[PDB]
Amino acid sequence: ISYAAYLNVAAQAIRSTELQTASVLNRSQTDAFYTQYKNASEPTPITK
Amino acid sequence: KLQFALPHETLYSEVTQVNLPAKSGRIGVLANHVPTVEQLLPGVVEVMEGSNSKKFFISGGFATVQPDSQLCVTAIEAPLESFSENIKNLLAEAKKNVSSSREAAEAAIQVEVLENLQSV
Amino acid sequence: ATLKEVEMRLKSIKNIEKITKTMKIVASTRLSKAEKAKISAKKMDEAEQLFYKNAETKNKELIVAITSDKGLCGSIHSQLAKAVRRHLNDQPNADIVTIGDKIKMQLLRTHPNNIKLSINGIGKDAPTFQESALIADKLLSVMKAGTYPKISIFYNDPVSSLSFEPSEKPIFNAKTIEQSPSFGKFEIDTDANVPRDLFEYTLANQMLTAMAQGYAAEISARRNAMDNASKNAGDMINRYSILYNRTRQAVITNELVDIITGASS
Amino acid sequence: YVAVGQKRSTVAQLVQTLEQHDAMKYSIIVAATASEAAPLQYLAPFTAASIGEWFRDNGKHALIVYDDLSKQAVAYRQLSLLLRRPPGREAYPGDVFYLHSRLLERAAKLSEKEGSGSLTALPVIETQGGDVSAYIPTNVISITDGQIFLEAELFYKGIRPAINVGLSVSRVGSAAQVKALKQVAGSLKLFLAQYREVAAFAQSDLDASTKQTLVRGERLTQLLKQNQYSPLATEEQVPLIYAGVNGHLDGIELSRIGEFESSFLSYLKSNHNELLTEIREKGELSKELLASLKSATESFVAT
Amino acid sequence: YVAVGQKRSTVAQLVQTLEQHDAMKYSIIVAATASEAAPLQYLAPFTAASIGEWFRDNGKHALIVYDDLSKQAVAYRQLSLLLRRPPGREAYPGDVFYLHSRLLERAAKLSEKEGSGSLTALPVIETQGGDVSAYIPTNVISITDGQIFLEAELFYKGIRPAINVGLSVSRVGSAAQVKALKQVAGSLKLFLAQYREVAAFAQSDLDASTKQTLVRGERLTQLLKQNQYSPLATEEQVPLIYAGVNGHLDGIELSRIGEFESSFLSYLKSNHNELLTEIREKGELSKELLASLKSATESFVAT
Amino acid sequence: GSDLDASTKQTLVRGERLTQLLKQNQYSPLATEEQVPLIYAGVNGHLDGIELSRIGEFESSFLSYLKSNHNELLTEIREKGELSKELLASLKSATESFVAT
Amino acid sequence: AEYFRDEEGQDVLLFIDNIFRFTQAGSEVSALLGRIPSAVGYQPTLATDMGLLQERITTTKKGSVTSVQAVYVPADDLTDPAPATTFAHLDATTVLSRGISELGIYPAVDPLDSKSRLLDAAVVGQEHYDVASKVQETLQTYKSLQDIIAILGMDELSEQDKLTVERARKIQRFLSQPFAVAEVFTGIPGKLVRLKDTVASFKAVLEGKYDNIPEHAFYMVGGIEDVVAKAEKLAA
């Protein structure tokens, strides 16, 4: 956890408010993975 | 002057007093405020120009008064009337999550945001 | 045959055109939203820059680069690749993190050793704070980013709407805050150290901006590329019209001769 | 019905359908079958024209469907080539033009002095793969005024009739038309044109306007599927088309378009078949008729 | 000037135009116009060419323009088919070749014996859309040496004359030119076939060297243009090609090419006509004359 | 210049080796006993690991390896015309040993 | 027609319909008569019969037969022998189009593909050729400008760029002329405008006296003088 992670949760929390728009929900929504790497050599990718 | 910017929308300010809640208690800026750096917590923010007041609901960010009379405000969210009850339900689910398990940190942000909301 | 084969090909060329045309319109659709965000992203970024100015700047290095997963956006992938390659020559030991599949493949051949962190599924998604935040939080543990005195991000700046120019800019570190001779004007106590919080937050806020600009030049580039495809594809259309025309004239001619040869005996 | 190059089985089908739906007692099938020698097949549209002409001359009317003139052409080829006239294009006789052109000049509406009569025509031409750069299609195309162009792709996709609207054209147009049906289909001609251009834009992300066009558009095409061997009267064409134009099908899901049509008609016929009778007979629509009809369409969609 | 297959109206326009331009008193015009029947068109180049040979065996130079040899092929085609001779490749007889080769080799430069006579030829072709897959065009091309490929696309886009130089060649036609006219044009032929390749990939590499060539090349193409029906004198054309060959169109931009040209010529004669007397009589440039021109051209480029 | 996922590229990769495996020059025929091994290596995917450029090195060297060592094995495939469980296991061990190239 | 010119000294304008059926009618005559069809299945007597026709049409020293013909090609083909022969006799093309008529502008004559081999400085006047070219180049550049203006958007114009667009769209409306024949349908009396007055008008658009005169008032006008009244009318 980082200060930006902390704030990222906080924005997500503030929209939890009674009003919202299409870009807000997207700004907090991720269906994204990340691939681990070292050295070509890789252990398996895992949800980000 | 005062700025508001978000990933998805830009806000343009002029402004006389800006009133802020920061991780050092509470900070006020009126005319030229001598430069201070505090990162803004989950906040209810008020701006007044003249005897008009305008209000904003802010998710936290960073604040920086620069010497020339310019309050650079950035936040990921941060209008107040626009923001607007399901957070209590979200709190109950966060309490469940902690039992098994970030989930701690998420429920801590929810409680922090819920006290702040009750002020409205 | 000649005759059939000409025709079959003209149907392929049409499908190639129609589909390149199709993309040009969805690319445009996407572009309007890509710009709209981008303006807003750029406005956040200045608020940091303002600070850094009055602060005075005292900024091993990281390289992140930003493209997409999806191909056929132009020479965006390989022009950014090459501009990464200059600064992997000013230090032949600099660490490359690749955000997107396309850029990844090309860099991986040139230096197999360097790739440590890489991120997928960002190319088919728009730049959004959730993704930049998670990339930023990971950046700190894996790459020990704050220890480095210079970090650099590269993107393609969409200077004008038929162009993109690869560009880089410098992201700050905790070292900069510390030793600048105008961290003194700005006031804070020992209660919060602005180095451990402000580095982390501006790692992401800068990063998001580059992500919107990079994407915008990429969808823009793709629109241009796909427009240029219709002009070329038309020229191929007109050529196959003449091929069809020559072929028709010979088929008619040859048929007559055979009937005549039959009547003649 | 001019059965040119059609088997005896093929006409046995036509006969059976015609009797089931009671249309035998004005219908004629002049038959020159495919086994039937090449001179009989050649003379079959010419003969049939005569049978019609006798009606036209007396002030009366008829409609003759020459099916398929493509085959008339092969028959002439036999005749021409044995009698040794050199063929022109594509080894199809050089005066084949002259043959088709002479026949299709009889298919017109006579003056008041001939006692007002006609022979209407609807010629049929079969194409190998849709090729109209061929001698037998190109001549006919010019000679005729109007074309209906069926598209192989439309057929598969369940759209029967499989008419492709861009290349389906009328060259005498709306001179002869019911006004009511004309009014509520001006809009249909432009909608459908538009919908085509934005169907190749949706091979994903789109604007709000274009995406409206798409949904609204699809409902219109789905209305244009009309089941084979099911006649429809002018008093029932006009209402349906009106619903779609005025956007009352927008709500109606595609699975529900087919049911929508029938149910709506029966509802209009019970509640007020006067309006329907007025449409039929007047052949026109009025500010008064349109108010009630529109109001009736709104109530019906809502339930 | 053999006019075969053209409109009798055009030829009458052409007869008058030459008498205004005072040039009809050393030219003949032969006619087998479109109206006049095919066997006379067939014989039209042959008959005229006898007249040409008469000048050539008096040991004097001549010219004959065969407009259009593609129309001689048609004239001979019609006569040939009505005599029962079956068509060859591209529906034209296979003896077409014979007419053109026999015809063409009666225009030839003779030796010292025959009075060093000549009859030159410019045979004018009607191409079937810029195709060179067709029989008649290739037959005229394989007998002949050199081509003056001309572009419609270029004519439309303001290049008059629109003489493309990519598919224009000279084989043995390249020892025509006296020394002045070998020096000045030196390797311009080559440079604008490096320009063609440079623009294929200017839809790889972009360098100053490639860009510089492209700028010179466009500028050079502009320079080639000249007013039609007042053809600029040869002596007058010699300085203009020097400039461009010596790369002196890096100071003139495309819009001003025409303006520079007349102002540069006016300048040269009033300043120094010595240079021009030399080229009128000698028709060979020496290094000293060449340098004197270079010195003068740069002076004009600045101001 | 489509972007290709891993499922698609297993095919494309497998194929390219096979194509190269097919490859022949002019004037060099071989007997059936010594085409039965080569086909096993391509179809049973022993070339997927082996680099595309050196499939042709491998084809020739593999054949020299067998001539010295497994010449008994090849005579059996020639005489009996079928590969048994025992012949299949032997053939599979042979490809394996030489799968480095 | 030939009797009116040679013996009554009067001009005659002679229309012909499809010349596609002229070639078609000869091929059959040929075939039946025992001649052998030529290239593309067509009459071996194609060039000579056409040549005789069109050298019977000319300006005599009394009067003239001019002919306006209608050209229809064999299923969109310009490499065939019969159009080629025709095109040789033609000295102009008027190219009527659907895209122009959808803007409710009749005349239908597509400006860009309307070209003549007698439109030149030496035939029509130097002035005339030059007025006619400027007006052509302006539409040509407008057309190209519009192409990338759709994709990028319409905020991209400079002061200079829009000057070509404005002058073009003024001409685009200005094209429509009420036709006498079509008087009911327009409701506006058909006008005629002689050759000298055609040049002058377009000159006036070139000097920009008519570069601020309303764009919806160019609809169905005649000469230069005429559209002053319509301009007053849109505004008032």
Residues from chain C that touch G77, judged by Cβ atoms under 8 A, are: 245, 248
Across the interface, of D86, D89, D207, the residue whose CB is closest to C252 is D89
In a shared domain, residues E169 and E205: no
Q: CB E40: neighbour CB atoms within 10 A?
A: 16
The pair phi, psi for residue B72, each rounded to 5°, is -70, 110
Residue C251 pairs in a beta bridge with none
Residue B40 pairs in a beta bridge with B22
Cα distance between residue C83 and residue A23, in whole Å? 32
Residue C65: in which H helix or E strand, if any? strand C61-66
Gaps in chain F after residue (C–N beyond 2.5 Å)? none
Residue G220, phi-psi category: left (phi > 0), alpha (psi -120 to 50), beta (remainder)? left
Is cis: bond before D250, omega within 30 of 0? no
CATH of the domain at E63: 3.40.50.300
The percent helix, strand, coil of chain A (3-state, each to 5) is 35, 10, 50
Residues 6+ apart with CB under 8 A from F75: F33
Cα distance between residue B71 and residue B60, in whole Å? 15
Tell me the structure's resolution in angstroms, rounded to a single decimal: 6.5
Residue B80: in which H helix or E strand, if any? helix B80-83
Give residues 86 to 105 of D whose Cβ lies within 8 Å of G: 86-90, 94-95, 97-98
Cα distance between residue D195 and residue D200, in whole Å? 9
Strand extents, DSSP E, B1-120: 4-5, 10-11, 17-22, 25-30, 37-38, 43-49, 52-58, 61-66, 70-75
* Distance of alpha carbon B17 from the chain centroid: 16
- Searching chain A, which residue's CA lies closest to the CA of residue B94? A13
In a shared domain, residues E154 and E59: yes
Based on the structure, what is the number of domains in chain F?
Answer: 1
In a shared domain, residues B72 and B107: no
Cα distance between residue C116 and residue A42, in whole Å? 9
- Which of D196, D204, D206, D209 best tests the C interface by mutation, with the highest count of C CBs <10 A? D204
In a shared domain, residues B34 and B47: yes
CB D197 within 8 A of CB D214: no
Give the orientation angle of helix G126-152 with respect to helix G195-206, to 10 degrees.
50
Q: Please, how many CA atoms are within 13 Å of residue E265, restricted to the half-sphere of its CB?
A: 14
Query: Positive or negative CA dihedral for E102, E105, E111, E116?
Result: positive
Q: Which of D123, D151, D177 is the last residue of a domain?
A: D177
Q: What angle do CA E22, E28, E29 make, to 5 degrees?
A: 105
Judged by a CB distance cut-off of 8 A, whether residue D132 touches chain G is yes
In a shared domain, residues E154 and E266: no
* Residue at B19: amino acid letter: N
Altogether, the residues listed in chain F come to a count of: 101
Contact C256 G151 (CB under 8 A): no
CATH of the domain at G173: 1.10.1140.10
Full set of structural domains in chain C with CATH: 1-25+226-265 (1.10.287.80), 26-225 (3.40.1380.10)
Q: How far apart are the two ends of chain A, measured CA to CA in Å?
A: 13
Q: CB E94: neighbour CB atoms within 10 A?
A: 14
In a shared domain, residues E1 and E136: yes
**Eight-class DSSP state of E124:** E
Q: Which of E144, E177, E210 is the last residue of a domain?
A: E177
| Interchain CB contacts (distance < 8 Å): C and E | 21
The pair phi, psi for residue G16, each rounded to 5°, is -135, 150
Residue E203's domain comprises 178-303
- Active-site amino acid positions of E: 171
CB C183 within 8 A of CB C193: no
Residues 6+ apart with CB under 8 A from C43: B3, B5, B10
Q: CB E289: neighbour CB atoms within 10 A?
A: 17
Cα distance between residue G143 and residue G149, in whole Å? 10
CB B56 within 8 A of CB C206: no
CATH of the domain at B31: 2.60.15.10
Across the interface, of C161, C249, C260, the residue whose CB is closest to G152 is C161
Cα distance between residue C86 and residue F63, in whole Å? 48
Q: CB D297: neighbour CB atoms within 10 A?
A: 20
Give the orientation angle of helix C129-143 with respect to helix A3-14, to 10 degrees.
160
- Three-state SS for G173? helix
| Burial label, G110 (beta-carbon count in 10 A; 0-12, 13-18, 19+) | middle
Contact G36 D86 (CB under 8 A): yes
CB G195 within 8 A of CB G207: no
In a shared domain, residues E31 and E104: yes
Judged by a CB distance cut-off of 8 A, whether residue C29 touches chain D is yes
Cα distance between residue G204 and residue G226, in whole Å? 13
Cα distance between residue D2 and residue D48, in whole Å? 7
Going by C-alpha positions, the residue among E2, E55, E66, E56 that lies closest to residue E28 is E2
Q: How far apart are the two ends of chain C, measured CA to CA in Å?
A: 29
Query: Positive or negative CA dihedral for E292, E293, E297, E300?
Result: positive
Cα distance between residue D191 and residue D246, in whole Å? 12
The pair phi, psi for residue G13, each rounded to 5°, is -120, 125
Contact E82 G88 (CB under 8 A): no
Residue D251 pairs in a beta bridge with none
Cα distance between residue D195 and residue D189, in whole Å? 10
CB G39 within 8 A of CB E70: no
Q: CB E2: neighbour CB atoms within 10 A?
A: 27
In a shared domain, residues E229 and E302: yes
Cα distance between residue C4 and residue C20, in whole Å? 25
Residues from chain E that touch G36, judged by Cβ atoms under 8 A, are: 81-82, 84, 86-87
In a shared domain, residues B110 and B51: no
| Burial label, F58 (beta-carbon count in 10 A; 0-12, 13-18, 19+) | buried
CB C107 within 8 A of CB C84: yes
Residues from chain C that touch A7, judged by Cβ atoms under 8 A, are: 133, 201
Cα distance between residue B14 and residue B69, in whole Å? 10
Cα distance between residue D102 and residue E17, in whole Å? 50
Q: Which of E149, E177, E205 is the last residue of a domain?
A: E177
Contact A24 B86 (CB under 8 A): no
Cα distance between residue E14 and residue E6, in whole Å? 11
| Burial label, D264 (beta-carbon count in 10 A; 0-12, 13-18, 19+) | buried
Cα distance between residue F42 and residue G21, in whole Å? 66
Cα distance between residue C143 and residue G164, in whole Å? 57
CB D20 within 8 A of CB D85: no
Going by C-alpha positions, the residue among E204, E170, E201, E301 that lies closest to residue E248 is E301
Spell out which chain A residues touch chain B, with contact meaning CB-CB distance below 8 angstroms.
Answer: 1, 3, 6-11, 13-19, 21, 23-24, 26-27
Is cis: bond before G107, omega within 30 of 0? yes
Going by C-alpha positions, the residue among C226, C232, C231 that lies closest to residue C28 is C226
CB G94 within 8 A of CB G41: no
Cα distance between residue G28 and residue G51, in whole Å? 19
Going by C-alpha positions, the residue among C161, C137, C149 that lies closest to residue C219 is C161
Cα distance between residue G171 and residue A8, in whole Å? 59
Cα distance between residue B113 and residue B78, in whole Å? 13
Altogether, the residues listed in chain D come to a count of: 303
Based on the structure, what is the number of domains in chain E?
Answer: 2
In a shared domain, residues E170 and E271: no
Residues from chain D that touch C254, judged by Cβ atoms under 8 A, are: none
Q: CB D21: neighbour CB atoms within 10 A?
A: 11
Give the orientation angle of helix E287-302 with respect to helix E274-281, to 10 degrees.
140
Residues 6+ apart with CB under 8 A from E17: none
CB E45 within 8 A of CB E20: no
Q: List chains touching G (3+ CB pairs under 8 A).
A: C, D, E
* Distance of alpha carbon B5 from the chain centroid: 12
Contact C101 F1 (CB under 8 A): no
Sequential DSSP letters for D30-76: EEE-SSS-HHHHHHHHHHHHHHHHHHHHTT---EE-EE-THHHHHHH
Cα distance between residue F4 and residue F15, in whole Å? 15
In a shared domain, residues D147 and D159: yes
Cα distance between residue E105 and residue E121, in whole Å? 10
The token pair at E20 is 């205004």
Cα distance between residue D223 and residue F60, in whole Å? 68
The token pair at E154 is 């270029």
The percent helix, strand, coil of chain F (3-state, each to 5) is 65, 0, 35
CATH of the domain at F25: 1.20.150.20
Is cis: bond before D68, omega within 30 of 0? yes
Residue B35, phi-psi category: left (phi > 0), alpha (psi -120 to 50), beta (remainder)? beta
Across the interface, of D86, D200, D206, the residue whose CB is closest to C29 is D206
* Distance of alpha carbon D295 from the chain centroid: 31
* Residue at F75: amino acid letter: T
The pair phi, psi for residue C137, each rounded to 5°, is -60, -40
CB D160 within 8 A of CB D225: yes
- Three-state SS for C141? helix
In a shared domain, residues D18 and D142: yes
Contact G54 E34 (CB under 8 A): yes
In a shared domain, residues B22 and B78: yes
CATH of the domain at E202: 1.20.150.20
Cα distance between residue G181 and residue G192, in whole Å? 12
Residue F46's domain comprises 1-101
Going by C-alpha positions, the residue among E68, E31, E65, E123 that lies closest to residue G55 is E31
CB C150 within 8 A of CB C60: yes
- Three-state SS for B40? strand
Cα distance between residue D39 and residue D195, in whole Å? 48
Residue B92's domain comprises 87-119
Across the interface, of C69, C71, C101, the residue whose CB is closest to F1 is C71
Full set of structural domains in chain A with CATH: 1-48 (1.10.1620.20)
